[PDB]
């Protein structure tokens, strides 16, 4: 069992027209 | 009365739409009380097998959590380990932690949640979770979440080669048995082993240990990481707790990775969120969620 890494990374565009801030 | 399947259906209904899901108070309380029993029936240091998917901070970005399952596969299609920080900062901490606890209850040997530094009353009283509970339900409900969070596991080891925790290493950590001996329920203390696991950071300009700029816990350098992996015969440290531009970021020649799964964090950053897939032979790969501009 030996940890390795894949070179390709998968990207997806998602919603940017969205509220993500909360009150505190 | 607790209908887990129904709860999950209601939570997942909102996909494709930041709309709320309003569960009954006794339903949310039930999620906490049942999940607390399961957390305590499992070890505080989890021993897990690949394949699984690993996610860092969510911070109440509920629709972004849904998007992670949409691309990773909904439980139990994939096993999941989350690295903590489910609540605070974002708009929908309640929906977020409710869905994660529901899945923990439904698939307790396929679905795992670690404690982050925000699953701590002294932090999430201030950074939004308490306000959200008070506004939408009441104070009693916040106190019930606290009682549940106090029983979350602290660390996991995947196939005896990947050590996972929210924050990082501790100068006090000499034996895994030390983690195992931590009794629950516990609050997160202001210093010491449990504090460091949830709060410490790597730092490429530190040799050995340093004072952390946050005002809590420590920073540690690359050679601390190396010596730790060699001593315990591990290959990798997987942790969260720092926003990173691409959602993942390597440290010390890929002996440590930071994962962060809240895209566009707070609205105050332009970061992607990432998830790490560990396949059966421990080949790790990354999926990236990126807000349109
Ligand atoms: Mn954190």
**In CATH, what number is assigned to the domain containing residue B111?**
3.60.21.10
Cβ contacts (< 8 Å) between A9 and chain B: which residues?
A: 246, 285-288
Q: Closest Cα to residue B1, out of B19, B21, B24, B17?
A: B24
What are the phi and psi torsion angles at B29 (to 5°)? -55, -40
CA B153/CA B46 separation, integer angstroms: 7
Is B85 annotated to bind a ligand? Reply is: yes
Distance CA B210, CA B200 (A): 10
* Cis, peptide link before residue B51, omega less than 30° from 0: yes
- Is it true that the peptide bond before B185 is cis, omega within 30 degrees of 0? yes
Quote the CA–CA distance of B97 and B62 in Å, as a whole number. Answer: 9
* Contact residues, chain B, for A3 at CB < 8 Å: 161-162, 235-236, 282-284
Radius of gyration of chain A (CA): 17
Domain count for chain B, please give it.
1
| Interface touch B128/A22, C-beta < 8 Å | yes
Give the distance from residue B5's alpha carbon to the nearest chain A alpha carbon, in angstroms.
27
CA distance B229 to B57: 24
Candidate list B34, B115, B118, B239, residue with the active-site label: B118
Exposed, middle or buried: residue B240 (CB in 10 Å: 0-12, 13-18, 19+)?
A: buried
Question: Beta strand pairing status for B45-48 and B236-239?
Answer: unpaired
Residues B66, B72: Cα–Cα separation, whole Å: 10
**Contact status, residue B137 vs residue B144, Cβ threshold 8 Å:** no
* Closest-CA residue to B151 (of B109, B106, B188): B188
* Alpha carbons B5 and B199: distance in angstroms, whole number: 35
| Stated resolution in angstroms | 1.9
Structural domain of residue B91, as residue ranges? 1-293
> How is B68-100 classified by DSSP, letter by letter?
HHHHH--TTSS-EEE-S--SSSSS-HHHHHHHH
Please tell me whether residue B199 adopts helix, strand or coil conformation. helix
CA dist., res. B69 & res. B47, Å (int): 23
Does B284 sit within 8 Å of A2, measured CB to CB? no
Q: For chain B, where are the alpha helices, taking DSSP H only?
A: 4-12, 25-41, 62-72, 93-106, 121-124, 129-136, 139-149, 176-180, 193-199, 222-232
Check A22 against B161: CB less than 8 A apart: no
Degrees to nearest 5, angle at CA B40 with B39 and B43: 85
Query: Are B227 and B206 contacting, i.e. CB atoms less than 8 angstroms apart?
Result: no
The whole-angstrom distance between B125's CA and the closest CA on chain A is 9
For this PDB entry, the determination method is X-ray
Check A5 against B285: CB less than 8 A apart.
Answer: yes
Contact A19, B19 (CB under 8 A): no
DSSP state of B159: T
DSSP B11-42: HHTTTT--------HHHHHHHHHHHHHHHHHS
- B283 closest CB neighbour out of A4, A10, A11: A4
């Amino acid at each position: 069992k030996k940890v390795t890494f894949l070179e390709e990374v998968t990207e997806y565009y998602i919603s940017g027209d969205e509220d993500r801030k909360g009150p505190w | 009365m607790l209908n887990i399947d129904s709860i999950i259906q209601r939570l997942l209904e909102v996909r494709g739409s930041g709309k709320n899901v309003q569960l009954q108070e006794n339903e949310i309380r039930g999620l906490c009380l049942k999940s607390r029993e399961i957390f305590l029936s499992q070890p505080i240091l989890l021993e897990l097998e690949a394949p699984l998917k690993i996610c860092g901070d969510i911070h109440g970005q509920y629709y972004d959590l849904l998007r992670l399952f949409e691309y990773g596969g909904f439980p139990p299609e994939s096993n999941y380990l989350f690295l903590g920080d489910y609540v605070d900062r974002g708009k929908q901490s309640l929906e977020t932690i409710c869905l994660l606890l529901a899945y923990k209850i439904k698939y307790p040997e396929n679905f795992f949640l670690l404690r982050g530094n925000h699953e701590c009353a002294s932090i999430n009283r201030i950074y939004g979770f308490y306000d959200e509970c008070k506004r939408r339900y009441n104070i009693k409900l916040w106190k019930t979440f606290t009682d549940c969070f106090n029983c979350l596991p602290i660390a996991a080891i995947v196939d005896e080669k990947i050590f996972c925790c929210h924050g990082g290493l501790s100068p006090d950590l000499q034996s895994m048995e030390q983690i195992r001996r931590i009794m629950r329920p516990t609050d997160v203390p202001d210093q010491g082993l449990l504090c460091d696991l949830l709060w410490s950071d790597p730092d490429k300009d530190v040799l050995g240990w340093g004072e952390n700029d946050r005002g809590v816990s420590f920073t540690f350098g690359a050679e601390v990481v190396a010596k730790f992996l060699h001593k315990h015969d591990l290959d990798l440290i997987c942790r969260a707790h720092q926003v990173v531009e691409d959602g993942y970021e390597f440290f010390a020649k890929r002996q440590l990775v930071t994962l962060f799964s809240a895209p566009n964090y707070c609205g105050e950053f332009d970061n992607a969120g990432a998830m790490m897939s560990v396949d059966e032979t421990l080949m790790c790969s990354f999926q990236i969620l990126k807000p349109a501009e």
